[PDB]
Design a protein around this motif. Structure first.
Motif, mmCIF file in Angstrom:
data_model
loop_
_atom_site.group_PDB
_atom_site.id
_atom_site.type_symbol
_atom_site.label_atom_id
_atom_site.label_comp_id
_atom_site.label_asym_id
_atom_site.label_seq_id
_atom_site.Cartn_x
_atom_site.Cartn_y
_atom_site.Cartn_z
ATOM 1 N N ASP A 48 -0.779 4.868 -6.511
ATOM 2 C CA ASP A 48 0.452 4.346 -7.074
ATOM 3 C C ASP A 48 1.205 3.502 -6.066
ATOM 4 O O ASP A 48 1.942 2.597 -6.450
ATOM 5 C CB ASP A 48 1.326 5.494 -7.566
ATOM 6 N N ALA A 49 1.033 3.772 -4.778
ATOM 7 C CA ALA A 49 1.699 2.957 -3.777
ATOM 8 C C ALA A 49 1.032 1.607 -3.623
ATOM 9 O O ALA A 49 1.693 0.637 -3.257
ATOM 10 C CB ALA A 49 1.720 3.680 -2.440
ATOM 11 N N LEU A 50 -0.268 1.523 -3.876
ATOM 12 C CA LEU A 50 -0.974 0.254 -3.806
ATOM 13 C C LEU A 50 -0.804 -0.587 -5.054
ATOM 14 O O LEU A 50 -1.044 -1.790 -4.999
ATOM 15 C CB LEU A 50 -2.461 0.482 -3.554
ATOM 16 N N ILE A 51 -0.406 0.001 -6.171
ATOM 17 C CA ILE A 51 -0.026 -0.804 -7.318
ATOM 18 C C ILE A 51 1.398 -1.310 -7.155
ATOM 19 O O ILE A 51 1.698 -2.438 -7.547
ATOM 20 C CB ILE A 51 -0.199 0.001 -8.617
ATOM 21 N N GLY A 52 2.265 -0.524 -6.518
ATOM 22 C CA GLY A 52 3.647 -0.928 -6.341
ATOM 23 C C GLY A 52 3.817 -2.116 -5.427
ATOM 24 O O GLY A 52 4.770 -2.879 -5.573
ATOM 25 N N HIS A 53 2.893 -2.310 -4.497
ATOM 26 C CA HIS A 53 2.893 -3.540 -3.729
ATOM 27 C C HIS A 53 2.330 -4.706 -4.508
ATOM 28 O O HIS A 53 2.494 -5.847 -4.073
ATOM 29 C CB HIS A 53 2.088 -3.391 -2.448
ATOM 30 N N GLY A 54 1.674 -4.454 -5.635
ATOM 31 C CA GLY A 54 0.998 -5.509 -6.354
ATOM 32 C C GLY A 54 -0.244 -6.003 -5.667
ATOM 33 O O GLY A 54 -0.674 -7.128 -5.903
ATOM 34 N N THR A 55 -0.827 -5.191 -4.811
ATOM 35 C CA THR A 55 -2.014 -5.553 -4.055
ATOM 36 C C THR A 55 -3.214 -5.025 -4.819
ATOM 37 O O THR A 55 -3.612 -3.874 -4.645
ATOM 38 C CB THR A 55 -1.940 -4.976 -2.651
ATOM 39 N N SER A 56 -3.781 -5.862 -5.679
ATOM 40 C CA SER A 56 -4.913 -5.436 -6.482
ATOM 41 C C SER A 56 -6.203 -5.392 -5.695
ATOM 42 O O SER A 56 -7.137 -4.712 -6.116
ATOM 43 C CB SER A 56 -5.096 -6.358 -7.677
ATOM 44 N N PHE A 57 -6.288 -6.094 -4.576
ATOM 45 C CA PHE A 57 -7.514 -6.081 -3.803
ATOM 46 C C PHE A 57 -7.551 -4.970 -2.779
ATOM 47 O O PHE A 57 -8.638 -4.492 -2.450
ATOM 48 C CB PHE A 57 -7.721 -7.429 -3.131
ATOM 49 N N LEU A 58 -6.400 -4.545 -2.260
ATOM 50 C CA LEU A 58 -6.369 -3.346 -1.435
ATOM 51 C C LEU A 58 -6.654 -2.110 -2.254
ATOM 52 O O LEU A 58 -7.179 -1.132 -1.727
ATOM 53 C CB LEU A 58 -5.022 -3.192 -0.749
ATOM 54 N N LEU A 59 -6.304 -2.126 -3.530
ATOM 55 C CA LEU A 59 -6.702 -1.046 -4.415
ATOM 56 C C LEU A 59 -8.185 -1.130 -4.735
ATOM 57 O O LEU A 59 -8.852 -0.105 -4.875
ATOM 58 C CB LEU A 59 -5.877 -1.112 -5.691
ATOM 59 N N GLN A 60 -8.706 -2.347 -4.848
ATOM 60 C CA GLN A 60 -10.125 -2.570 -5.077
ATOM 61 C C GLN A 60 -10.945 -2.180 -3.867
ATOM 62 O O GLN A 60 -12.059 -1.676 -4.008
ATOM 63 C CB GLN A 60 -10.349 -4.041 -5.382
#
Length: 57
Positions: A45-57
């Motif tokens: 949820d913290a990696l979606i809150g940054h809007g970083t879709s590739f760090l989540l990937q």
DNA sequence: TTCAACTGCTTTCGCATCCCAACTACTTTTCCTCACACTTGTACTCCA
């Protein structure tokens, strides 16, 4: 002064790659099994809150 | 038109009966060491 007994030896670990699990092919757990670090539910949820879709990937 | 059971959820890493044995017995494994009953003459006289 006083020196406390509990110390910071068995606290650090680093993994570049290594062992997996046979069912999931995900990194194994373990301090001394040379095992991975868990990106849990709250860090997803913290990696979606940054809007970083590739760090989540 | 309501009462009462069946219902999944509180966190965030790391910590943390069968077997064995005891002691004292009795026994077997054998090998070694001698006696106990039998017999012919010879000896001491035996009866001729």
């Amino acid at each position: 002064y006083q020196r406390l007994r509990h110390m910071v030896n068995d606290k650090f670990q680093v993994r570049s790659t290594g062992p997996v699990n046979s069912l999931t092919m995900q990194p194994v757990k373990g301090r001394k099994r040379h095992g991975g670090i868990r990106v849990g539910e709250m860090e997803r949820d913290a990696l979606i809150g940054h809007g970083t879709s590739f760090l989540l990937q």
